[PDB]
Ligand binder design. Sequence first.
Ligand SMILES: *Cc1c(COP(=O)(O)O)cnc(C)c1O
Ligand SMILES: *Cc1c(COP(=O)(O)O)cnc(C)c1O
Ligand SMILES: *Cc1c(COP(=O)(O)O)cnc(C)c1O
Ligand SMILES: *Cc1c(COP(=O)(O)O)cnc(C)c1O
Lengths: 331, 328, 329, 338
Amino acid sequence: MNLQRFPRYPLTFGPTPIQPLARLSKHLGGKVHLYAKREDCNSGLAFGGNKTRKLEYLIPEALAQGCDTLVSIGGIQSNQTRQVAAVAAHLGMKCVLVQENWVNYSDAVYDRVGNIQMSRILGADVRLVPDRSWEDALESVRAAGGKPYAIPAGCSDHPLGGLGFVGFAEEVRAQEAELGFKFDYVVVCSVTGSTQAGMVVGFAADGRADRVIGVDASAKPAQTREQITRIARQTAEKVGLERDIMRADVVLDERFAGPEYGLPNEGTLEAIRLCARTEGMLTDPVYEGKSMHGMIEMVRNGEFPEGSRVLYAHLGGVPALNGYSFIFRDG
Amino acid sequence: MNLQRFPRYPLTFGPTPIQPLARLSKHLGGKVHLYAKREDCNSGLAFGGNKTRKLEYLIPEALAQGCDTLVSIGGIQSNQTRQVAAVAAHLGMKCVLVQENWVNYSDAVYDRVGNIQMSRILGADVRLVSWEDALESVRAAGGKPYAIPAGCSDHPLGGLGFVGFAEEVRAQEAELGFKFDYVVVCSVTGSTQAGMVVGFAADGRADRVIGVDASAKPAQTREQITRIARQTAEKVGLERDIMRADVVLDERFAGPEYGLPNEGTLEAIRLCARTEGMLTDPVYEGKSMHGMIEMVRNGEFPEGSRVLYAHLGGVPALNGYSFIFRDG
Amino acid sequence: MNLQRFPRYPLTFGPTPIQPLARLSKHLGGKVHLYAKREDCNSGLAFGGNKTRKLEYLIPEALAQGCDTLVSIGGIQSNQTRQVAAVAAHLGMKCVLVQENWVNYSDAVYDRVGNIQMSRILGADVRLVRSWEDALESVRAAGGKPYAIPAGCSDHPLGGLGFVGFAEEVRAQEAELGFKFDYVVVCSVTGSTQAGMVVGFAADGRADRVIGVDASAKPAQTREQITRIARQTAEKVGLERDIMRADVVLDERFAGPEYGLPNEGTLEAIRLCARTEGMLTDPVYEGKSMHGMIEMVRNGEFPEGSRVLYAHLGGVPALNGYSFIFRDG
Amino acid sequence: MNLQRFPRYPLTFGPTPIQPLARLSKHLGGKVHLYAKREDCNSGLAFGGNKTRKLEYLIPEALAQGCDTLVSIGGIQSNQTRQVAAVAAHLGMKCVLVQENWVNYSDAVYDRVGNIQMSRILGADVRLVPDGFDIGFRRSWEDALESVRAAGGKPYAIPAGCSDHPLGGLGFVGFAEEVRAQEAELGFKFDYVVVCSVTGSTQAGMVVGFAADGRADRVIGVDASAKPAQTREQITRIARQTAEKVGLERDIMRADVVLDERFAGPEYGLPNEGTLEAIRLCARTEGMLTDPVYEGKSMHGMIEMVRNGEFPEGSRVLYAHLGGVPALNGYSFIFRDG
Ligand SMILES: *Cc1c(COP(=O)(O)O)cnc(C)c1O
Ligand SMILES: *Cc1c(COP(=O)(O)O)cnc(C)c1O
Ligand SMILES: *Cc1c(COP(=O)(O)O)cnc(C)c1O
Ligand SMILES: *Cc1c(COP(=O)(O)O)cnc(C)c1O
C-alpha cells in the first residue's frame, strides 16, 4: 500500500508511545501481557486524542479547498467536536459545532464542563439543538461569507477519515521492530468506526486485520460493524491494500457496550477504577472505560492465549469524566 | 554544577516539546517571538504537568527509604495532589492527600470534578479539611509515609526537577540553533522557578527567568523561591551565590487572590486558546499567560526577543470554574 | 370512629386551604371541576408537607417516652427526612437521618441541593450509606434515646392518623363550602397518606373515591401497604367496618419508569399545571399524581359535573435535583 | 390614611401568621422576645413571599388596563421575578423576565436551580444575558417592553422588586394594618420590627403603615444592598410618595427611616460568616430557614442587636420573614456540611 500518497498536516507531537501495563497484567494473573499506545497524549491541542490523528489527513484538503471554517458535530460531551475546535483555533479557522443530545443522561453541568467547556473557550460557535441543524450550520457559514469544511461524526464517514489509523498500524510495526516482537492483538473502542477501520486496513497489510479486536461502545453493533466494514474497504482501496477486507476481518465484540451509548454499566466503572489504581492511567465512562472493561474481561476469561501481547489503544476521552461527577464522588 | 549525582525516576515520556506560538505572536504585533515548552503534556499519568517533572527526583528517595505511601497536600483543585495520586498508583504505593479550602471560591461541584475527581478515581485517600496528623496517620496504621510538601517545593530535592529543565532547554536551543532570551513561568510554592533560576544561572541567564506570581502574596513566594534556589544551587554545586537580582517575580497579574482570576486572566485564557488551540487555567497558567501577553503588549520585551513560555499544566481545574465560561 | 382519642402536636398553621383550579379545569374541557388542598403550604417548618401532618400524631409519643433524638430515613431527596429534621430543630431534639440512594439517578448536585441541603442546615446528622438499626443503636450507645420514624412515617402505629384527620378536615370544609367533593387524588408511595384518607373517608362511605396514584413503580407492594396500614388504622380509631381491599383504589398507569424518575407525561403535567395555575409539582411525586388527574379528566374517566380534590402533598424542593431536565423550562 | 381606597387582588392565603421564636429568644438570653410574621408562607404560587403581597395592589391596575403580559426584572436568583412568573401564570397572562447576573458570584448551577428554575417551569420567557452584556447599560428593560408590543401584546411594567412603582408601597402599608389587628389579640404592641431592605418599598410601606400610629422609627430596616445610602434614600422617597398616596396626614421625617448598615457585607448577594452563623442558629433553634442573600442578613441583624443589648430588656421584636429561601440552592457548596 501507499498512505504516503496523501499529505499529512502535523497536529500531533509525533508517534505515540507504547507502555506496558505490568501492574494490571500481573493483577489479572500474569498470563497475558497488556500494553497501551497513548493516542490520548498525542497532542498539545486541548488534550487531542484519536480524532486528532484522523484530522491530520483531512486538514490538507480543507486548506487546499480554501475553506475558512471547520464544521462538525456530536453529543454534548463529544471528544470529536472539542478536537475540531482546538485544531481550528490552531489553524486560524472559525469553527461551528452542532451538539446534539445523544445520551439519556441529565447531569446538572453536563453541558458546562469537560469537552464542551473547552470548545467554547477555544472560541467555537457551539450550537445546542433545542430541547437540520447540520445543514443550517453549513449554510450559516456560507451566508456569512465563509467556506465550511464539513467534518462528519467522528470524522469517520468521510473519504479521508480512515487514513489516520492506517498510519497507526504503520507506527506499531516500526515500534515492534525496536521491541523485537509483534503484538498478538489490538483492543480498540469503536463507535463511528473509522479508527478501527484504519487499523483493519493497516494491519491487513501484514495479515493481522482480524487481530484488531474492536469493542463496541455504540450499543448498536450492527450499524457500527457495518460502518467499520464499509469505511475499511473504502480506505483499503484509497491506499492500495494488496488484499481485500473480508467480513471476518472486522471483529467487533458487543458485550461491553451496555446499557446505552454514553452510559457506563458497573463493569465499566470497575475497569476504570482497576486500571486507574494499578497504572495511573485514566479511562472514561463513555468510550475507553468500555474497551478497557472488555480487555480485562477477555484476559479474565482466558480468551487471550497465555503469553499473548495485547496492545490497548487509548483513544482519549478522559475530560468527559467531568460530566459524571456523582458516580465518582467517593472515587 | 552536577545534577547527574541525583537519580531520576522516569515518570515522563521524555524531554518536553517546544512549540512556536506564531499566531499569538503575530496577533500581538510580530515584534516578539513567543514559544511554549509543554510541561503540561509530559506524562501519561493523569495529564502530569510541572509537578511530575519534580517528582522524578523525589521518588528514588521514597523508594530508597522503603516507603509504602505517598503523602501530600494542596487546595481542593490542586494539580500537585492529583499528580501524586497518579505517580503513587503507578508505583504501586498508597496515597493520602490533604485537600484544604485554599480558595475563597464557591462552586457547586468544586470538590467533585477536575483534579480532585481524578485523585479519587486513582485510588487516593482524599481528606478534606493538618499535614502532621496525616503523616502520623499512616505511621499509626503501620505504613511508611513519604512526606511531600505543597508543590514538592520546600524539600531538599524539590528543586532538582527544574534544574533539569534548564539543562533540557540548553540542548534544545543547540538543536534549534538559537537561544531563548527569556522564559516566563508561573510561581506559587517556588521550586519550579527556583530550579529554573539555578539551572539558568549556570549560563548567566538566571535574571532572564521571568516568574509571574499567582499566589497574591508576592513577598512570601519571592522569599521562598530565593531560599529554595539557594539550597538547590548548593545541592548541585552551582559555583556562585543566588542574589536577589537572579530572582525576578512580577506581581502585577496575581489578582485578586490565589485561585481567583481577574478579567485579564480570563481574556488571556481566551486569546491564547483561540489563537493557538492551547488551553490555560484560571488559577495558574492563565495568569502567567496574561503576564506574558501584557509584557509583549507594553513592549517590555526588546524587539526581536524569543520568549519561552513554560506551560506547567493545570487545565483540568477549568472544570471547577464552569459558570464563568458558560458562554465562552 | 374516634380520632380525638389521640393527641396531636401542632406543627402546622392549622387546616390547609382548598383552592379551585379554574384555569386547569377550563383548559381540559370544563367538564370536571378541579380543586387542590394545599398540604404543601401547611407549615413554617422548612416548607412542610404531608409528612408534617403525619408527624403531629407521632411527636406526642416521642415526648411522652422522653426521647431526645428523632431518627428517620429516606432517599437522597427525601421530603420526609427534611420535615423530620425541621420538626426536630423546632422541638429542641437531635436528628439522625439515614439517607439512601433509592433512585437510579446521578445528578452532580443531587446530594447538595433541595431537601438534603435543608436537613444539613437544620442541624440534622445526615448519614449517606444494618444501616437503620445501626443508626438507632448509635443514638443509644451515644447516651441518647432515639424515637424511630420509619420511611414516610408510614409503617408506624401512629402513622395513619394524620390523614384520618385530613378527612375530618375536608368534611368540615365541605360544610363551609356547601358542597362535597366526589373524588380525591393523592400520590402514594409508602402508604399511610392514602390509608389515613381511606379510613377517614370510609367514615362517610367515600374511601373508594380516594384515587391513589402510584409513584413507586412497584404498585403491588404499595397497594398492599396502603391496605395493611389502613386496616391497622381503621382499627386503631375504631372504625365500625373492616377495611376491604376494594376500599383501596390505586392507579398504576403514571408511576413510570421508576421511582424517582419522571416520564415525558410527568414533565408535561408539571408544566401544564404550573403554567395554568402557578402551582408547582415535582418529578418524583406530585407531578405523577397530577399527571394522573389530568389524564383521567382528559380521558373522561371522571363523570361530568364531578368535583375532584387534588391533595398536593409537597415535594417541590426536589425540583433542584433535576435541573438539567428543566434548563429551558 | 385610607388604604381601602385601592383595590387588592387576592394572591395570598389571607393575613400571615405570627409565631414566637421562643427557642432562639431563650438561647440569646431570654431578655428580648423575638417573634416572626411569615410573609414567606403567604401564598400557594411558587412559595410566594413579600413581593407577592406587593403584587396584590399592582394587578388590579394591570387588569384594568387590559394588559396581557407581565414584564419584570432582577438578578439570576431574584425572588421577585419568580413571584411575577407564578402570578402571571395564575392569572392567564404571559410573562417576560429580563435577567442578568447582578452578583459577583458564579456557582455552577446558579442559573438553573432555585428561583430561575421555577420561573422557567412556570412558563415565563426568561431573558438571561451573558456576562458583559449589561441590561442596565443597553436598556434591555425597555426593549423587552417593546418586544411584547411589537409581538401584539400589551405589557404591564413591573420595576425591580415592585418598589419604584406608584403602587409598590401599598402592600406593606396593609402589613402594618394586619399587625395592629393581630396586636389587638395579643393584647400588646411590638416594640420593634426587623425587616430586610434592598429595593425599599417593603420597609417603605411599613414606615407609612406604622407612621399612622407613631412607630415608623420602630421599623428597623437591615440593609442587604451593601449600598446603604442609595437604599436609605429609596425607602424615604417611596415612603413619602406612598404616604401621600394613602392620605397619611404626616410628613415622613428623615428620622422615621431606620436602616442599619452593619450586616449587609461584603456585597449584595454574598453572605458573610455572620450571615451563615445566623442562618444556622435560627434554623437549628426554630426549624425556620432563611437565605444567604436577604433574610439571613436581617436575621444576623436581629440576633446581633439582641446579643449586643441594643434592645431594651423585656422588648418584643417582630421579625418579618420576607421569603427568599429557594435561593439557597444556588449556594450549595457553602452548606455542603450544613
Ligand atoms: C470517537 C472516540 C472513540 C470511537 O472512535 P470511532 O472512530 O468513532 O469508532 C473511542 N474513544 C474515544 C475517546 C473517542 O473520542
Ligand atoms: C503548582 C503549579 C504552579 C506553580 O508552581 P510552583 O513550583 O509551586 O511555584 C503553576 N502552574 C500549575 C498548573 C501548577 O500546578
Ligand atoms: C411521601 C410523599 C408522597 C407519598 O406519600 P406516602 O404516605 O408515602 O404514600 C407523595 N408526595 C410527596 C411530596 C411525599 O413527600
Ligand atoms: C425583595 C426581597 C427583600 C427586600 O425587599 P425590598 O422591598 O426590595 O427592600 C428581602 N427579602 C426577600 C426574600 C426579598 O425577595
